Design a protein around this ligand. Structure first.
Ligand SMILES: [Mg+2]
Ligand SMILES: [Mg+2]
Ligand SMILES: [Mg+2]
Ligand SMILES: [Mg+2]
Ligand SMILES: [Mg+2]
Ligand SMILES: [Mg+2]
Ligand SMILES: [Mg+2]
Ligand SMILES: [Mg+2]
Ligand SMILES: [Mg+2]
Ligand SMILES: [Mg+2]
Ligand SMILES: [Mg+2]
Ligand SMILES: [Mg+2]
Ligand SMILES: [Mg+2]
Ligand SMILES: [Mg+2]
Ligand SMILES: [Mg+2]
Ligand SMILES: [Mg+2]
Ligand SMILES: [Mg+2]
Ligand SMILES: [Mg+2]
Ligand SMILES: [Mg+2]
Ligand SMILES: [Mg+2]
Ligand SMILES: [Mg+2]
Ligand SMILES: [Mg+2]
Ligand SMILES: [Zn+2]
Ligand SMILES: [Zn+2]
Lengths: 87, 25, 125, 100, 96, 81, 129, 208, 216
RNA sequence: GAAGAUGAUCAGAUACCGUCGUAGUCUUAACCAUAAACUAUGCCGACUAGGGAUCGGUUGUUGUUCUGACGCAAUCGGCACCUUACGAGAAAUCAAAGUCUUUGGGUUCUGGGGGGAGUAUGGUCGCAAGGCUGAAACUUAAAGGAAUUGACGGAAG
């Protein structure tokens, strides 16, 4: 959100759920941010270098967080043949 | 009083009214 | 009845959590020690505290007590529970040398890129 | 307010259920609503099963049982302590009491 | 569907239903029945003159305890008899 | 399940569905070629036949109607077309 | 019975979006449903949608992207003059800067901004934001 | 993506199959359906241990992404997992919560053992409901060892395994510990045999 | 002398976290009011209502005092606190504390053209508590806060200049009215608008980048 | 077994309790048209969540007994139930009482503070008892719903 002169009058551009695209509210304490380490070719975790996902408290409350991470990680290559698109 | 008996009392009083009016028709 | 109160129960377990190495199983020694360790206003409370500290020490020497940690219980337990047998009991040496998995699981093993010897067991019940 | 989701009876998918008489007071109570207990008691009390077996002319004679199904209205059952007042959350429990 | 018609051609049903149901509103009912014209002692007027018949003390309702000093007045316009309160400390002595 | 391929359901779950509840409804019935034991003459019979069908050659009942699939008489072999 | 297939379609889309699903199945399809979906897709409120031919009214599978707050029909389809569009957008839309009232005009089914661009009006059909 | 060295090795597959990890409960909830390979005719559900392995590696990579190892809290109210979580904490530097979980440990900031973990790992979602419930109050992600009947509410990473097995719990915890140390570099590579044996991490009765 | 007991408190006592928007971006729970005092120094509170509630006992009623406090900076942040205590002064002091702990950001937007600073809400919002439903509608630059004095005070402390309001239900229940209006004003950062459709990268949490400063 | 007759209890009980008892209870021809006629929840259509039972039909299949029964799977329809609360609600609670200020799938009926009063009057139906339709004057600041704490109970523990 910006004014006529172009300044970003918006404070706090919020985060969005990786699964449902909902805005993660300031007091949504059931929402989490999963951080998964990147692994180099030696099998070592690269320090301070992560794949990050955010889940709203709605998804976590419904129990869909596990299946959503399975899908998101499989699409990002973090997993192989664990999540299936067709049920 | 109980609603059922209140209804019965009013029914008997309507009955009396009708009988009283029938004298003069 | 002779039920000790919380002012003696918690004061005794603070003594155990704080001076276990210096404590003992003797009431007379515990009585003298708590008179130099704690400021007890009355002799009767001192004796009650030392008698329950002695009872707790006598119970600790017979095994672990619930709720009292004195900076040596876990130090002794960390290396007390390190037992591991030479044979793994999960290593496939107790059997003939191959898994006793069910034939249905054997299909899962074949589905994965694995060649694992199997003696299929069909309970079928 | 509504005290029970079952309205204190066991009528669902039904219009009318014919009544039964309370064993104790002969009150008409719907068959689904009545408190029903099946009792199978020995016909001879255990004190007398001995002297009656000694007085028996039959070797290995089995004493017959007494079979009965009792129907109580809510008042009969509560008064006779067949059922008792339970807490609001304990009312929902409908498994037989774990005594036997 | 909220229990009222929504069709584009159901204006008659909506208008008639509202017309039937405004009779449950006593302000509308009293306005159209003309109860003030027929039943009100003043006949719908704000004020009305009359002749004082007698000075009467009326006991107040509980929990209050007092004698509210009113008068019986016969209205000139229609001859009806009403009770009228005389406000303030001692204004009954002004009314004969 | 929030993300799911509705256009390509798994054929296993697709086969358990009611005949009207698939993406495109399709009958589960079929037509059969019935060989009576006496002779060999193709007779097309509906799987869920409501008629006691008799073959043209010999007046022998091939199937007896039931609630669902028709029941073939003894000595009658069917082959799905 | 089934009196409005557009209302059924939009209700199904709303329930799937509220539950976080990324796809929804609509049955039956129609031209009005497809053109309403085309307006929503053109403005980015839905993703790709798919028409399934079953030699009947048809079926649709819609991909949802989580941007849709609410879509709905307006029953009945009131006649809307150009001067009434302001009243409808005031009542239905959350703000003056986004959201669309969908109309069916003789120039076609379109949002109220396009209707203002070509200076046409018809019957109100629904909304989306 | 991932090097092929991270694939399920035959040795680990032998451990997993010999430990009855693949035996899942009779009744499976709808959310655990992807983890079931096939139902055994007695009624037990066979767990796709390839998926179990991959979830183990993903979970260990999330654990390895936490900077302070003590910020990882490993929980077990079951007695079968208490030794496993205690040894996991010893090897990895995590903070173990064995036995009873005191309600308010995450929300009540004046309690004795008030912790603020960045990640909570659970032996069983059913018996550790309190830890999951409070983590959902203070934005704590949850990794849980889930059986086919385990609830999935407020569980982010589910490791499909047998939660009710004496050897299953210890093996899964041992596998996580090995992978966390491999990723951290404590174990030099993915081929060196680890000193610790899966018998350690197995619950021992007071008899011994 | 404040000694923080939380990771967030330690990171705020040090200069690691300097604005409440970093707190809100990661939904960090706030449990120490000194965090809010440090990051939002210029806060104004208002005791909207004081009520006496009674618990009947064997001897007689047991009366306690219930205070409702609205806190805000008139620049996009507002909180609401309700606390019961034996005394009015203590009830007010604790309600101020939890009003600080509940401070949330609000989204100001434009009615019509985006000329100048935002003056109104970006969309229609509604909140409900009990039977009371409070609806806030964006209003042009002339109209002030068209609301009852209770909701108007919350809007002023939140920094909204121009807004229409409508309430339904038992609005005389002041606590429910304030809770419903507070929920509505907080829904501005929950309503997805097209200018927020762009995907933003998930930054690392400050508790992650400053893990050692929040250790102990 | 209404009414009634009678013996108890009681200060009085033509009440409760006991013994009899007439209409009635049953049936045939007609009337009556009302019930807490209740799920106090209109009907039709769509969608939204997990689970195990169960009745009817159909379709695939057993370490089972003797074709049928049973067992294991699917499904359509029902009668329900358990869990959760996404959601609703004032709450009790509700898989509908949800998809309702982010307010519009179709449609019928009903309500508008408490009484007066389902009364009066007119009409109409009925053999009658009565049914249906149905006011006003006047009067009144609450009546009422759900829940909380306590107090009490000839309620339980
Ligand atoms: Mg009652
Ligand atoms: Mg009935
Ligand atoms: Mg129309
Ligand atoms: Mg068309
Ligand atoms: Mg038109
Ligand atoms: Mg009002
Ligand atoms: Mg007498
Ligand atoms: Mg008799
Ligand atoms: Mg007769
Ligand atoms: Mg009748
Ligand atoms: Mg009626
Ligand atoms: Mg009923
Ligand atoms: Mg009714
Ligand atoms: Mg009807
Ligand atoms: Mg329906
Ligand atoms: Mg619908
Ligand atoms: Mg069946
Ligand atoms: Mg079929
Ligand atoms: Mg329920
Ligand atoms: Mg129900
Ligand atoms: Mg009224
Ligand atoms: Mg009440
Ligand atoms: Zn009775
Ligand atoms: Zn033939």
């Amino acid at each position: 959100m910006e004014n006529d002169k172009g300044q970003l009058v918006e404070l706090y551009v919020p985060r969005k759920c990786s699964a449902t695209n909902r805005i993660i509210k300031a007091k949504d304490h059931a929402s989490v941010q999963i951080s998964i380490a990147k692994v180099d070719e030696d099998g070592r975790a690269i320090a301070g270098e992560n794949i990050t996902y955010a889940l709203s408290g709605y998804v976590r409350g419904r129990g869909e967080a596990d299946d959503s991470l399975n899908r998101l990680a499989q699409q990002d290559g973090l997993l192989k043949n664990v999540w299936s698109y067709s049920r | 009083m109980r609603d059922k008996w209140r209804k019965k009392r009013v029914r008997r009083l309507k009955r009396k009214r009708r009988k009283v009016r029938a004298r003069s028709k | 009845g002779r039920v000790r109160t919380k002012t003696v129960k918690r004061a005794s377990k603070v003594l155990i959590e704080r001076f276990y190495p210096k404590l003992t199983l003797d009431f007379e020694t515990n009585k003298r020690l708590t008179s130099e360790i704690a400021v007890i206003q009355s002799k009767r409370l001192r004796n009650k505290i030392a008698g329950y500290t002695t009872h707790l020490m006598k119970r600790i020497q017979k095994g672990p007590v619930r709720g009292i940690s004195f900076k040596l219980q876990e130090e002794e337990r960390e290396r007390k529970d390190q037992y591991v047998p030479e044979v793994s009991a999960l290593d496939l040496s107790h059997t003939n040398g191959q898994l006793e998995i069910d034939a249905d699981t054997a299909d899962l093993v074949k589905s994965l890129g694995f060649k694992i010897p199997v003696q299929t067991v069909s309970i079928s019940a | 307010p509504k005290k029970r989701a079952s309205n204190g009876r066991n009528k669902k998918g039904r219009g009318h259920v014919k009544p039964v008489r309370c064993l104790n007071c002969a009150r008409c109570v719907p068959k689904d609503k009545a408190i029903k207990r099946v009792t199978i008691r020995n016909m001879v009390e255990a004190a007398a099963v001995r002297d009656l077996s000694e007085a028996s002319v039959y070797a290995e004679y089995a004493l017959p049982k007494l079979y009965n199904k009792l129907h109580y209205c809510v008042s009969c059952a509560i008064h006779a302590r067949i059922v008792r007042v339970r807490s609001r959350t304990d009312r929902k429990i409908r498994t037989p009491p774990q005594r036997k | 569907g909220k229990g009222k018609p929504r069709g584009l051609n159901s204006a008659r049903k909506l208008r008639v239903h509202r017309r039937n149901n405004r009779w449950a509103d006593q302000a509308y009912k009293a306005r159209l029945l003309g109860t003030a014209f027929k039943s009100s002692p003043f006949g719908g007027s704000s004020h009305a003159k009359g002749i004082v018949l007698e000075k009467i003390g009326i006991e107040s309702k509980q929990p209050n305890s007092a004698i509210r000093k009113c008068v019986r007045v016969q209205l000139i316009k229609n001859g009806k008899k009403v009770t009228a309160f005389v406000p303030n400390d001692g204004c009954l002595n002004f009314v004969d | 399940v929030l993300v799911q391929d509705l256009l390509h359901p798994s054929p296993a779950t697709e086969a358990k569905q009611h005949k009207l509840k698939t993406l495109v409804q399709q009958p589960r019935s079929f037509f059969m070629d019935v060989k009576c034991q006496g002779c060999l003459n193709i007779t097309t019979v509906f799987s869920h036949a409501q008629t006691a069908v008799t073959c043209d050659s010999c007046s022998t009942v091939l199937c007896t109607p039931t609630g669902g699939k028709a029941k073939l008489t003894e000595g009658c072999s069917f082959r799905r077309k | 019975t089934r009196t409005s297939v557009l209302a059924d379609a939009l209700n199904a889309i709303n329930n799937a979006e509220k539950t976080g699903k990324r796809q929804v199945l609509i049955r039956p399809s129609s031209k009005v449903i497809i053109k309403f979906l085309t307006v929503m897709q053109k403005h980015g409120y839905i993703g790709e949608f798919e028409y399934i031919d079953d030699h009947r009214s048809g079926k649709i599978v819609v991909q949802l992207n989580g941007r849709l707050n609410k879509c709905g029909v307006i029953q009945p389809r009131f006649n809307v003059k150009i001067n009434d569009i302001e009243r409808w957008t005031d009542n239905l839309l959350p703000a003056r800067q986004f959201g669309y009232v969908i109309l069916t005009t003789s120039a076609g089914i379109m949002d109220h901004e396009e209707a203002r661009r070509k200076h046409v009006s018809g019957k109100i059909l629904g909304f989306v934001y | 993506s991932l090097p092929a060295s991270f694939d399920l090795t035959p040795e680990d597959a032998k451990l997993l199959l010999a430990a009855n990890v693949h035996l899942g409960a009779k009744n499976v909830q709808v959310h655990n359906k992807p983890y079931v390979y096939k139902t055994r005719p007695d009624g037990m559900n066979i767990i796709n241990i390839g998926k179990t392995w991959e979830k183990i590696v993903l979970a260990a990579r999330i654990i390895a992404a936490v900077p302070n190892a003590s910020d990882v809290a490993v929980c077990s109210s079951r007695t079968f997992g208490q030794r496993a979580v205690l040894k996991f904490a010893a090897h990895t530097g995590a903070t173990a919560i064995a036995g009873r979980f005191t309600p308010g440990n995450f929300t009540n900031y004046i309690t004795r053992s008030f912790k603020e973990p960045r990640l909570v790992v659970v032996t069983d979602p059913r018996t550790d409901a309190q830890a999951i419930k409070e983590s959902s109050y203070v934005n704590i992600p949850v990794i849980a060892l889930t059986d086919m009947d385990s609830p999935s509410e407020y569980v982010d990473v589910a490791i499909p395994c047998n939660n009710k097995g004496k050897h299953s719990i210890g093996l899964i915890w041992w596998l996580l510990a090995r992978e966390v140390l491999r990723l951290r570099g404590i174990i030099p590579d993915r081929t060196t045999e680890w000193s610790v044996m899966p018998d350690l991490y197995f619950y021992r009765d007071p008899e011994e | 002398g404040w000694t923080p007991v939380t990771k967030l408190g330690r990171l705020v006592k040090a200069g690691k976290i300097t604005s409440v928007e970093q707190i809100y971006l990661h939904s960090l729970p706030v449990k120490e009011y000194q965090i809010i005092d440090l990051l939002l120094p210029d806060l104004k509170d208002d005791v909207m209502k004081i009520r006496s509630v009674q618990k009947q006992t064997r001897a007689g009623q047991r009366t306690r005092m219930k205070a409702v406090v609205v806190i805000g900076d008139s620049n996009g942040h507002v909180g609401l606190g309700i606390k019961t205590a034996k005394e009015v002064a203590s009830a007010i002091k604790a309600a101020i504390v939890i009003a600080k702990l509940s401070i949330i950001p609000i989204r100001r937007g434009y009615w019509g053209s985006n000329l100048g600073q935002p003056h109104s809400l970006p969309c229609k919002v509604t909140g409900k508590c009990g039977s009371v439903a409070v609806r806030l509608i964006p209003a042009p630059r002339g109209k002030g806060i068209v609301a009852s004095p209770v909701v108007k005070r919350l809007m002023q402390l939140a920094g909204v200049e121009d807004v229409y309001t409508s309430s339904s239900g038992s609005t005389r229940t002041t606590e429910n009215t304030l809770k419903a209006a507070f929920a509505a004003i907080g829904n501005t950062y929950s309503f997805l608008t097209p200018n927020l459709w762009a995907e933003t990268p998930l930054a690392a949490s400050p508790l992650e980048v400053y893990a050692e400063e929040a250790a102990a």
